[PDB]
Amino acid sequence: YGHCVTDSGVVYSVGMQWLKTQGNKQMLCTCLGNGVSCQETAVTQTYGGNSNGEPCVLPFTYNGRTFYSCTTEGRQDGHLWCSTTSNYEQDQKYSFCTDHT
């Protein structure tokens, strides 16, 4: 009835995007309306960019929002990129991402 719970105790809320692990793999879990879905891996391969590819540091904050993985909200081209420094608004250290092609 709105609130989202993973049966683990975490009483999320309809729209409290979060991140869940599998004791080895990463996975972003979110509660929409029909239930609770997630994004396997979440992250993506990083090449060149500003960090020549490296372990991003998400979920980070950009433009005032948050991103648990790559994103193209910082450009008008469509190239996926991520952050490698908790402080991207100070360092600007970011990397790109493929995902598809």
Curated annotation (Swiss-Prot):
Top-level lineage group: Eukaryota
Disulfide bonds: C4-C31, C29-C38, C56-C82, C70-C97
Domain Fibronectin type-I: 2-41
Cell location: Secreted, Extracellular space, Extracellular matrix; Secreted
Modification comment: Sulfated. Forms covalent cross-links mediated by a transglutaminase, such as F13A or TGM2, between a glutamine and the epsilon-amino group of a lysine residue, forming homopolymers and heteropolymers (e.g. fibrinogen-fibronectin, collagen-fibronectin heteropolymers).
Residue span, Fibronectin type-II domain: 51-99
Role: Fibronectins bind cell surfaces and various compounds including collagen, fibrin, heparin, DNA, and actin. Fibronectins are involved in cell adhesion, cell motility, opsonization, wound healing, and maintenance of cell shape. Involved in osteoblast compaction through the fibronectin fibrillogenesis cell-mediated matrix assembly process, essential for osteoblast mineralization. Participates in the regulation of type I collagen deposition by osteoblasts. Acts as a ligand for the LILRB4 receptor, inhibiting FCGR1A/CD64-mediated monocyte activation. Secreted by contracting muscle, induces liver autophagy, a degradative pathway for nutrient mobilization and damage removal, and systemic insulin sensitization via hepatic ITGA5:ITGB1 integrin receptor signaling.
Protein name in the entry: Fibronectin
Organism per entry: Homo sapiens
Parent-protein residues present: 305 to 405 of 2477
